[model samples]
Target: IKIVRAQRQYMFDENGEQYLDCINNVAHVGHCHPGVVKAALKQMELLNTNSRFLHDNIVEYAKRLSATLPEKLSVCYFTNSGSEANDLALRLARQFRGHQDVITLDHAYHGHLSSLIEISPYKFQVKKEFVHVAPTPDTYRGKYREDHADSASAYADEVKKIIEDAHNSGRKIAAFIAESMQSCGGQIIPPAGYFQKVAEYVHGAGGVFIADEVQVGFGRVGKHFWSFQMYGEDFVPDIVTMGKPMGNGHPVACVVTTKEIAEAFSSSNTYGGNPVSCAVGLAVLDIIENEDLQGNAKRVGNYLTELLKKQKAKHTLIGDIRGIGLFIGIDLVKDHLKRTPATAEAQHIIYKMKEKRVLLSADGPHRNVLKIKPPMCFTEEDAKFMVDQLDRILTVLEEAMGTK
Candidate 1:
């Protein structure tokens, strides 16, 4: 394992050796950010209690966070993690719509909680459970013929078909949940206009469209504060769930939705809006805006994408590279013609990368995609160093495989 002791943009091990950090999607604002630490320390000294009673910090944080969203999405429900937020969203959706059925993309990962697992196909597939699974708008995995002209439109047609089937079966879909960008499913970005079409279909079927922005939100897309905005104005989801970097390493997450949904959940959790979590949440937003961390994510993430793409051109094993801002993935294939995943080889690369003092992880159904989602504070130099180390390790691996 790569040892890590102190870190900011990059992490240093117990040996004092620095390693360029990538694959840390949760460390959005960078490791141990001074601003977040200071805020937490100050708040801890003043007050830290459960949300059984009223607290100014919690109320103030809700106000500040509400201002970030569109006026319609003003209400908030704070939770300890994304999983809790997702579980809460499901409860809110069922209460708001009074239905049990929900629609979700195949291979989509919402969270680890039992309620979320019921809707997540990724969990079901691994466990071999017969659960609700819908067709994912994955142009890469599914066989679909489309030019750049109408790719998103074609994908939308597929979703329409599924909705029609559900409707004919006399089942009312309560909500349609998905990650704005599929983080676990090979970092797959939905085709252009994909969400717009899918959202329309779900809404048409009386289902609330829920965008699981736990991994893709908070300016990781570069162009917008949330990844849903990247899908253009045509797509407006009913509920948005956020986590991971929301608290900048603090245990805080939230579900932002319309007033109607918020009121539904209000009948449930007494400690939903605790003071301390909100304080940390508000501080995270303050730090992001004050330091312009979103802008930094955009700048540094683009640079890393370009650098990785250049390296991709040189390596035959590098099958596909795609992502926006700091969220990126590299798919490893056995050969150009086969396009088959070299899962063992991919594991070897990750092992060697760790040995070289770098941190990286693999995901996707085949477990061949190298995830490179570092913190927003990662610099261009960090990108360069990561790419360099990868190049060196891959060269050695390629030679070793050639002899086999």
Candidate 2:
């Protein structure tokens, strides 16, 4: 569908059909938010030059952005997109300790850059010698399940084993990168304490911990500003890269690290941290605060998760409801016991929802997980409407399969 326009949480097609956006966290605050658009227009009207000149907007924007993160993450490197941010993150990590190997989670996707593609198992589907892949810490249906006494330690041990094996093979680990809460990897939430343990191991091996908050950062997770912070205060990543939600649909991204790491790398980007982008970024932050989008995310996220759980109890297809705040996924399965991904069934439901004018998507390796990271302005009514439509579609599909 050709989107003629978008406003808040809805999109309009050329034919004027309205779509309830259910998977657009990139529009962080909301689509076409007045404040954000106004900031951009005002800045563009005045000056939108490269970062070569000294600009107060860059300094002020970086100051505001850094205040949201831990004190150690003080240095900021602005980029145009998450791909560039991740690529720069790789450079910083590799340059920090002069190590070449990177440890990424299995089925993970960081960005579209060549370096990211090599590390993202979701795209490459093949292993690179310098890049190591660890099993996703999926407690529901992974090597270590909820039944395990300590899934966090168990999952962390997997990384430790990977490091040991790499060491024996004459490879040194430079970084262990992963999304705070896996988005494209089926919304897998790493068990609590997992990151702390992983960080400890990676730190021991002279590798920096890079948390890719590209898709799930900036108060989307409700209780915390960054999803990684949900882990605990003790688990501060060596580097954090964020985008998508930072500029509320604008192409602005950032990589924040420690002073030591920032000092090691010497690089610059022409368009990164330009005046207009910084203005937009600042506006997004202000809007989030002024409108209390974080509070909204928490309130609506709780309501949506509860509704989804009820649906899971009602429908056989919904095998799992995973996520904390706006970043949520409905894992569809053909069999509850086996937890086999209901890939075709999920595809059918999304199309069915589309017919009802609600926008939804299915992702993950098998494409059976319904992803929902709508704009932060997503309302309770919106949540109810989407869930009700999902309920109806699931009923029809189950009936057709003779399971209802």
Candidate 3:
């Protein structure tokens, strides 16, 4: 049976029992946060209309959001979903660069739109759809190196190879898109300096580097508002897409890029930055700052990471526990040495966890990584509860499985 019946940090079911939530990343602030609800209500009562008409909420929100990014990334284009934001980003890239060819990482999920699908290897490879798949900086799945340093260099080399091949084929590359951290791809954090080198390569090839921050933005990574910032200032991407958490459960997403790209897409959208959505977006930013949710995520996420590490030390099935801030992933393995994903076993664990009063989701190519991207309002107590429950469930599952 589904565990959640009502929305809260902890969800309830028909039995009146609660389940700690550790999977709803889109609800960045919290489920039905009061600030968001209040702003949306007030805006709806005042005005709610298409972008064709001028509205104070849209203008105010645009100004407020632009202040958070680097000076070069001052342009804003609002959309309804991450997919739309990505689709627009693609159009902007082609318009600015005047090219049709695009490159994307293997196992990277940008969005669900048709244009994005053409560059998303995760969807293409899984569904056998049309796409141009490129190598990813996947240390766990790709060639194993001693450390992140080696892996980062190797991944950059792969990008360089793809650029060369595209040039040889007489194809003009437009853009290279990748998640700042491979969220769906096992929550794979790129190795240090990975994006810096890769961004350099893409820019050198006269192509824009698009950071798909749909799953890892809004200070989810603890260190910065954008996950790409974790790589360093030198690795500035040409285009960055924000979504999921921007509207705090409402449907609003945006693309922030350079002036050149923005100028290229000087077209109008009827409902791109409507009044109500902007108000909701502004309220989300307010709540994120006022409650110090980003700081909470960093502190609580580190605590959870430490606790998971302790669990990893005891459990032979856990191959890796990696992430930053609240965006965490736990990889289930058959054996520590083999690193073979226990795919079915992981799914069983998820089902068992639901029975034990907790909610989570799995991702990655093998669906072995347990995603722990809870709402920012999730407290320390909630983190501990989730870890304890996961510990119990994993222990029981391990006991049931007699073989190593």
Best by TM-score: 2
Provide the lowest-lDDT 10-residue window in model 3: 124-133
Instruction: After superposing candidate 2 on the true structure, give the runs of residues whose Cα lies further than 4 Å from its correct spot.
Output: 267-272
Task: Please identify which of the two predictions, 1 or 3, would achieve the higher TM-score against the true structure.
Answer: 3
Name the candidate that leads on lDDT.
2
lDDT against the true structure, per candidate, is 0.79, 0.91, 0.82
lDDT of 1 by residue, 59-96 (tens): 89878877867678877788888998899888788788
Residue by residue across 251-304, what tens digits does model 2's lDDT show? 899999999888777632543478999999999999989999989999999999
Candidate 3, residues 1-404, lDDT tens digits: the string is 55545464767767778877888788888888878899999989988878676678888898898887777888888898999989988888888868777778888888887777777777764432223466777777666444555878788888888788878878777888888889878898888887888778888889898989888899888778888888876678889998868997688999989888877667426435889899999899888889888898899889999999999987777888989999999999998666888899889888988877778888998899999998887888988888888888888888888767
Candidate 3 accuracy as TM-score = 0.94
| Ranking of all predicted structures according to lDDT, beginning with the best and ending with the worst | 2, 3, 1
Q: Candidate 1, overall lDDT?
A: 0.79
Please give the lDDT score at residue 138 for candidate 2: 92
Count of backbone clashes, every candidate in sequence = 0, 0, 0
